[PDB]
Design a protein around this ligand. Structure first.
Ligand SMILES: *[C@@H]1O[C@H](CO)[C@@H](O[C@@H]2O[C@H](CO)[C@@H](O[C@@H]3O[C@H](CO)[C@@H](O)[C@H](O)[C@@H]3O)[C@H](O)[C@H]2NC(C)=O)[C@H](O)[C@H]1NC(C)=O
Ligand SMILES: *[C@@H]1O[C@H](CO)[C@@H](O[C@@H]2O[C@H](CO)[C@@H](O[C@@H]3O[C@H](CO)[C@@H](O)[C@H](O)[C@@H]3O)[C@H](O)[C@H]2NC(C)=O)[C@H](O)[C@H]1NC(C)=O
Ligand SMILES: *[C@@H]1O[C@H](CO[C@@H]2O[C@@H](C)[C@@H](O)[C@@H](O)[C@@H]2O)[C@@H](O)[C@H](O)[C@H]1NC(C)=O
Ligand SMILES: *[C@@H]1O[C@H](CO)[C@@H](O)[C@H](O)[C@H]1NC(C)=O
Ligand SMILES: [Ca+2]
Ligand SMILES: [Ca+2]
Ligand SMILES: [Zn+2]
Ligand SMILES: [Zn+2]
Ligand SMILES: [Zn+2]
Ligand SMILES: [Zn+2]
Lengths: 526, 526
């Protein structure tokens, strides 16, 4: 009397609706990957040949491409319902459009439960939202009952826009309460589904008695047993077998991100609800898997509707936005000033008491600004086509925790080859830097002043070498681009943020007219 | 035979719907003036005792109080119709909310002609806007026909937002074409009604053959015969008799502004349309004239709605907006930075020739900022009530043409008593000032750099002593307040702008969240 459960799972799909390139960009080439149409095919084939199948999502369907900026989650609702997901745990980006952008459209229109056990409401609007979200759900699978408990990263307040009246509690403390409740209700098979990262997933697997399987996300973790099928590098076996405090192996799974893989885990339980076997591997959604015709047709219709989003006037510039190489790579460029003002504006989060905001600074290397925008071309009208010329790579702006000394080392790197025309020079917001190019490379920073966060009135204070700062920066720099090895982020100090063109476009739309100046954010001693 | 025409006229009423103080601020109830209810009474009394009466408005009903900010011209439609104006010429401020804000509600709902002969539509606007704005109107008055030709200042593209498809032509040339047309049509009594200022009114009186009377506005010009009744000083007789090029004495009239006076001119024409006599005086609308109870009840009903509106959330601050005297009168205050950023944003106009905008700088004396706004008080919610606490006097931000030498003299005055806590210290936008307070008073300005206008990318350049600049500044300073005699403007170098709390409120409404920093716009060197 044993029970075989097949778990299919996705996480951090991040608005990759259409099939993508191998790097989950726009597929311009022959061999494409992922997309909902391909996922729908593999899910259907598995459901037709496997007896007991659960389809779970571990959060962060929101945010990532213009698909989310235009359809605002209606594309998530539509295809998750069409694919018949059995449950979804909330990710940090599901709060990107606030609690109203979560209620409408997601909470109001999904045909499956939305789970998050470690969220406590404190205001009337937040408690309205939480009425829609359950801490767990019992799902009938064949003759058996499977309990699924949700959880969401405690960093959602700093990463996204849940508002001040939504509290994110400790995952292990909240999950144990609902595991114990499920046990008393007679449910002996329990899956923890959530968006807090691989390390937190392993802690849950270790500490929460009664949890049999952990399905996570947030860290884009790729696990594989054997030689992986594409260019992602495995951080461990799939599933990762975490030894519990109870002396059992608890399978922990994630399936990378961007819909490139479909998680596929076969779990066998004994008749007491103990996992006796757990095996499988994430399925690479490459050209060998046919795109489902009906989903592909709906995508092809929606691509036509996206043309409105791409050619609509967002706003206007009344000044030349000087994104030429000669400007952005050699001195202060007013376009760089606008981009980093837009980035700071997008990361204004509910202040937690001792700060007017958790971050006040942004940087972007001149090499990341790929084109000017001419205000004389078409009455300064800005659409996504002009913004794509500036920011063509579909990257994000991320949050990096960084010591003052490290930050100052980045600004030394910013002018260590100044004059050679490469893309290092940092355009900034919330920073005043003074350079002396006469000096030897590595000693050209005269002074750095930054906008305080621990203040009621933002004001410029000297950078402190031993203090820890938050800084916004392009994903390219956070991966070490352009020799910025000291800006490289990891799971301990780095968080993936919002799409770059979406950040800038929203800002331009808010301003209506833009006229950024060269204002002395960087000063050359000459 | 002779023909007696009584002309009643208003100009630059500027949203003074309720009765006002002597200086056209908010009334205390002690001794009030103007308001539409009082004007309605005097108009009724004159119509009951005079045979042939015309009630004309020479423009600038729009803009000036919270009445215009909320009702957006619906209050002008309502009471100008109820008072049965016979004609109105468009003023520069009728374009403050663009053509859409002029068409709706004013052009489509007034029950009297709207006149402006020197406005030429282009392309899409043409069709109906040609039908809504007429160059002239023939009005039957008793047994006679009186032609009224409208005109509007050519400076409207720079003062307001008429948009790119409206051309403003020369007043004398266009008025002459239509005077000739009216003359050929058999109309021998012709009134020029318009909004271009006293100097242009007299030029029209001198040069436009066939014009018998000029009724003007824009400059708030006060004319009176004999000793004036209040604190306004007469710039000339009422009417002002301009000798025409062909030896005709042409009466020119204006009636100050803000509805304090009702213009009142008795004109005697002979049977061939020549003015034989022009006599009268503007009627001071003081408490000896009763507020019409029915109009007052309508005002009171509408004011109840305005009181609700003034307590509504416009936006939020996530920082303390430090409008305390200790900040704004001694050093850089982030609230002053926001105010003048809002002022510059409000004055972005269609750039002609060589400039990204016609003005780039704003100043506001610390003494004009009367309160902070606490971000901890009510979740940082900003309403019109909070803005009224900061800017309580109902003033405007005006445009002043000023040479660099005078501006530098103004910034010396800004710190000549620094430390005494008086209100001179200038908060700025688009200006970088460096002070040295150790120097003798009058020599404390180290440097002044300003945002260039004649540039594609705004950038800071040294102030040139002999160059003429445009600067935005409060109505209080343009009148010489706080010892700034050198900022005092006249019609040759000064233009009255929009209500201060509307400028700030609209910017906050657009920004959504505000977070101004102290960023070194002014620096006190050791
Ligand atoms: C966008 O930024 C670029 C780079 O800063 C601007 O180009 C540069 O413009 C400056 C000032 O016009 C030039 O300095 C001067 O050039 C003129 C004629 O080229 C020369 O006669 C002067 O002696 C002085 O050196 C600079 O050479 C020029 N550099 C390049 C590579 O073009 C550009 O003007 C900016 N775009 C806009 C629309 O403002
Ligand atoms: C709004 O602006 C005012 C004016 O600057 C601020 O008041 C001033 O705040 C400073 C703190 O930055 C006070 O200074 C410090 O003084 C104490 C002695 O009391 C000493 O520890 C140091 O010498 C330090 O410089 C200053 O005394 C204070 N002035 C007054 C008249 O209160 C005010 O804090 C600002 N409001 C907010 C909410 O930020
Ligand atoms: C007061 O206003 C509340 C919110 O309304 C908004 O602002 C007012 C000023 C109007 O412009 C309204 O159209 C806006 O939606 C109302 O909920 C409330 O009913 C108002 N109070 C009364 C007595 O009507
Ligand atoms: C096109 O985009 C604009 C801007 O988001 C939106 O307001 C409008 O409704 C869209 N039009 C259609 C037909 O979807
Ligand atoms: Ca179990
Ligand atoms: Ca005549
Ligand atoms: Zn994610
Ligand atoms: Zn995440
Ligand atoms: Zn006026
Ligand atoms: Zn005017």
């Amino acid at each position: 009397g044993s029970f075989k459960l097949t778990i299919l799972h996705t996480n951090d799909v991040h608005a990759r609706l259409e099939q993508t390139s191998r790097d989950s960009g726009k597929c311009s080439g022959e061999d494409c990957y992922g997309g909902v149409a391909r996922r729908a095919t593999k899910i259907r084939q598995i459901r037709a040949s496997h007896r007991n199948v659960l389809l779970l999502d571990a959060g962060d369907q929101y945010q990532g491409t213009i698909w989310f900026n235009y359809f605002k989650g209606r594309e998530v609702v539509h295809f998750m319902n069409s694919l018949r997901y059995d449950a979804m745990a909330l990710g940090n980006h599901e709060f990107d459009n606030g609690l109203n952008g979560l209620l409408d459209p997601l909470l109001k229109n999904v045909k499956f439960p939305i789970l998050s056990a470690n969220i406590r409401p404190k205001g009337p609007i937040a408690s309205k939202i939480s009425g829609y979200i359950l801490p767990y759900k019992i799902i009938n699978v064949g003759s058996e009952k499977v309990g699924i408990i949700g959880y969401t990263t405690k960093e959602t307040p700093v990463l996204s826009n849940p508002g001040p009246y939504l509290e994110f509690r400790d995952e292990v403390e909240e999950l144990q309460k609902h595991a114990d409740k499920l046990t008393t209700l007679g449910v002996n098979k329990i899956i923890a589904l959530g968006h807090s990262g691989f390390m937190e997933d392993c802690r849950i697997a270790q500490k929460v008695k009664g949890v049999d399987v952990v399905v996570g996300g947030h860290t884009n973790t790729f696990l594989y047993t054997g030689s992986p099928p594409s260019n992602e590098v495995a951080a461990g076996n799939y599933p990762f077998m975490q030894l519990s405090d109870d002396g059992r192996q608890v399978p922990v799974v994630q399936a990378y991100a961007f819909g490139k893989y479909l998680g596929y885990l076969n779990v066998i339980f004994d008749d007491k609800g103990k996992v006796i076997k757990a095996s499988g591997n994430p399925i690479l959604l490459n050209k060998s898997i046919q795109e489902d015709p009906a989903v592909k047709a709906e995508i092809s219709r929606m691509k036509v509707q996206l043309q409105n989003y791409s050619s609509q006037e967002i706003g206007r510039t009344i000044v030349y936005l000087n994104g030429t190489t000669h400007a952005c790579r050699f001195h202060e460029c007013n376009l760089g000033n606008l981009i980093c003002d837009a980035v700071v504006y997008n990361n204004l989060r509910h202040p937690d008491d001792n700060e007017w905001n958790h971050v006040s600074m942004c940087i972007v290397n001149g090499g990341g600004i790929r084109s000017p925008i001419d205000e004389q071309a078409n009455n300064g009208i800005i659409t996504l086509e002009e913004l794509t010329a500036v920011l063509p790579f579909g990257g994000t702006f991320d949050l990096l925790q960084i010591k003052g000394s490290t930050l100052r080392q980045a600004f030394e790197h910013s002018v260590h080859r100044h004059g050679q025309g490469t893309g290092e020079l940092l355009q900034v917001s919330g920073i005043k830097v003074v350079y002396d190019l006469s000096q030897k490379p590595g000693k050209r920073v005269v002074s750095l002043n930054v906008l305080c966060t621990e203040c009621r009135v933002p004001t410029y204070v000297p950078l402190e070498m031993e203090k820890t700062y938050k800084v916004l920066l392009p994903s390219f720099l956070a991966a070490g681009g352009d020799g910025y090895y000291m800006l490289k982020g990891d799971s301990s100090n780095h968080s993936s943020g919002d799409l770059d063109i979406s950040i800038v476009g929203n800002y331009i739309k808010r301003m209506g007219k833009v006229f950024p100046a060269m204002e002395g954010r960087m000063v050359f001693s000459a």
